Amino acid sequence: SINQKLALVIKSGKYTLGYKSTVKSLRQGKSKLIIIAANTPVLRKSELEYYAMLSKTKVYYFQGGNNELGTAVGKLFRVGVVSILEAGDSDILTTLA
């Protein structure tokens, strides 16, 4: 499941949280995968698609809002978008999620 994959990446793998820090990693070309929440607004979402498709980065849509995306990565503050800089021991990116 998607929560079991992300529970690995937090405890052993590079990542970053929130909108401004991800867009820098998209610009610099470090981000391999990004995870966008459902409840994020559409101008925000459609911007991150456009930054991604220039850089040729894979984009997953988390079925769930920004509160419970925060629960999945395991942080008590809510998070709208998450990016993966480096993969963990588990495979994440190569699977269809």
Partner: protein, 101 residues
């Protein structure tokens, strides 16, 4: 101890008809009628007061120069700046999506 009159023929405390008590060069207190306070101009979208624009009564904008009323960005006089930012972002992406359709 010294007390003070309305100068004008209206004797009621209306929104217009207000008073400040002022010490003169004569050395006595006197009323001075304060005009009503200028509200800030707003951004007609986000709905908040917007910077580098003078707070004047609406007739008083006709006296004042252009650089008071404007700011130099496109849509500067009438937009929040952050709300100008959004619609430049939005115009660009929706126009790009129209080719993808």
């Amino acid at each position: 101890a010294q007390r003070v009159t309305f100068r004008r023929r209206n004797p009621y405390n209306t929104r217009s008809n207000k008073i400040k008590v002022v010490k003169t060069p004569g050395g006595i207190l006197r009323a001075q009628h304060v005009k009503k306070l200028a509200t800030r101009p707003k951004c007609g979208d986000c709905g908040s007061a917007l910077q580098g624009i003078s707070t004047l009564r609406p007739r008083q904008y006709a006296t004042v120069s252009k650089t008071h009323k404007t700011v130099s960005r496109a849509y500067g006089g009438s937009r929040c700046a952050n709300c100008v930012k959004e619609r430049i972002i939005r115009a660009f992406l929706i126009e790009e999506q129209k080719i993808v359709k």
